Amino acid sequence: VSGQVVCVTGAGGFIASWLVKILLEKGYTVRGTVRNPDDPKNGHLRELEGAKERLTLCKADLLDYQSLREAINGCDGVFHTASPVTDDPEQMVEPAVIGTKNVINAAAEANVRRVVFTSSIGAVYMDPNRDPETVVDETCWSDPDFCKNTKNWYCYGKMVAEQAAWEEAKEKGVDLVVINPVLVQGPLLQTTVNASVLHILKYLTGSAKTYANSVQAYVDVKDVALAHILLYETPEASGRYLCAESVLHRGDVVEILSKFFPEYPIPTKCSDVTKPRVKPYKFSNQKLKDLGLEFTPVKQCLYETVKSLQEKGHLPIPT
Numbered sequence: 226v227s228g229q230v231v232c233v234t235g236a237g238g239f240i241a242s243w244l245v246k247i248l249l250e251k252g253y254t255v256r257g258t259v260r261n262p263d264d265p266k267n268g269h270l271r272e273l274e275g276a277k278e279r280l281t282l283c284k285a286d287l288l289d290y291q292s293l294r295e296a297i298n299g300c301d302g303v304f305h306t307a308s309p310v311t312d313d314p315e316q317m318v319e320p321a322v323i324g325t326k327n328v329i330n331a332a333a334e335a336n337v338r339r340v341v342f343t344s345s346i347g348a349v350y351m352d353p354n355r356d357p358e359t360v361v362d363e364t365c366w367s368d369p370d371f372c373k374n375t376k377n378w379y380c381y382g383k384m385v386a387e388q389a390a391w392e393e394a395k396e397k398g399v400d401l402v403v404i405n406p407v408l409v410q411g412p413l414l415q416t417t418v419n420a421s422v423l424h425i426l427k428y429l430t431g432s433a434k435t436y437a438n439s440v441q442a443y444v445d446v447k448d449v450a451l452a453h454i455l456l457y458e459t460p461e462a463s464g465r466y467l468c469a470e471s472v473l474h475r476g477d478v479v480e481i482l483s484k485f486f487p488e489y490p491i492p493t494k495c496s497d498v499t500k501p502r503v504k505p506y507k508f509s510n511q512k513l514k515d516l517g518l519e520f521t522p523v524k525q526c527l528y529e530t531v532k533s534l535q536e537k538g539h540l541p542i543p544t
């Protein structure tokens with residue numbers, strides 16, 4: 226793997242920082258794109274093992290095609306992870322969809338071996354019709370109008386970006402593999418708190434006063450990073466890959482948190498118990514397991530998320 230060069234888009238982000246860290250540990254040369262290499266929020270990347278010799282931070286934006294050409298030039302592979310993470314369609318849609326087309330086109334011109342695209346469970350799950358008992362897997366796609374009508378614009382953007390990626394890759398003859406993570410937790414390498422981790426932080430700060438009657442899937446950030454690498458490196462990898470460890474009710478989540486962190490104002494009350502407690506849905510992560518990926522149990526992952534938030538100043542012990 227020595228002498229191999231890969232681009233990671235949006236390299237200073239939550240998932241991408243772990244991806245860059247592990248790529249460098251494995252011996253890769255990495256060209257990580259960030260909007261401003263001199264911004265202190267990217268400083269953690271420079272301090273990674275191997276970064277001094279093998280990490281270049283390339284100034285780029287998803288909507289600046291030439292900047293992407295410069296970053297991707299000479300790469301063997303591209304991990305396209307950069308995206309807005311927002312339900313504001315004015316912020317979400319163009320960098321997701323046009324940005325993704327731009328990345329695939331730059332990768333095609335650079336003659337890269339493979340692109341791995343970070344999609345989401347949001348591109349898989351959000352289908353009104355799908356029977357509740359059906360196993361959620363890679364054959365499932367979300368309903369766009371439904372995402373649109375429910376103002377799930379983040380899910381819409383990820384889905385349409387994924388569709389654009391397949392379409393453009395097909396047209397340009399690019400080997401594309403897609404990973405679809407569920408909600409990602411784990412320790413943060415970066416200084417700020419990204420969207421997925423806010424979902425845990427709100428319980429520890431007590432800004433969340435109750436927990437909803439709902440379930441969703443969780444996965445550890447280190448597993449997600451390893452999975453991106455596994456999809457790049459395995460010649461036979463093909464299509465989409467659901468990346469998820471287990472599904473938990475929010476009630477289960479706050480129980481785990483409150484047992485680990487009894488000093489914090491984690492909510493104990495369900496928002497609304499008018500309906501029976503929602504049961505975890507069935508899913509398959511067999512595709513990734515079949516490639517050898519082992520998933521870290523969610524409890525460990527949640528614990529490490531809070532310890533990280535504490536280290537980084539976000540959770541002083543209450544008085």
Ligand SMILES: NC(=O)c1ccc[n+]([C@@H]2O[C@H](COP(=O)([O-])OP(=O)(O)OC[C@H]3O[C@@H](n4cnc5c(N)ncnc54)[C@H](OP(=O)(O)O)[C@@H]3O)[C@@H](O)[C@H]2O)c1
Binds near residue numbers: 240
């Ligand atoms: N965390 C999860 O639960 C989860 C689950 C499924 C999928 N994903 C996907 O995982 C990927 C990474 O997200 P994340 O959770 O790690 O969030 P994150 O920390 O917010 O990372 C997103 C990165 O994308 C960037 N970016 C946004 N717009 C850009 C643009 N126009 N040009 C260049 N870079 C841009 C960011 O840069 P700036 O900091 O400069 O804005 C940021 O580094 C995304 O594709 C996301 O949709 C995440």
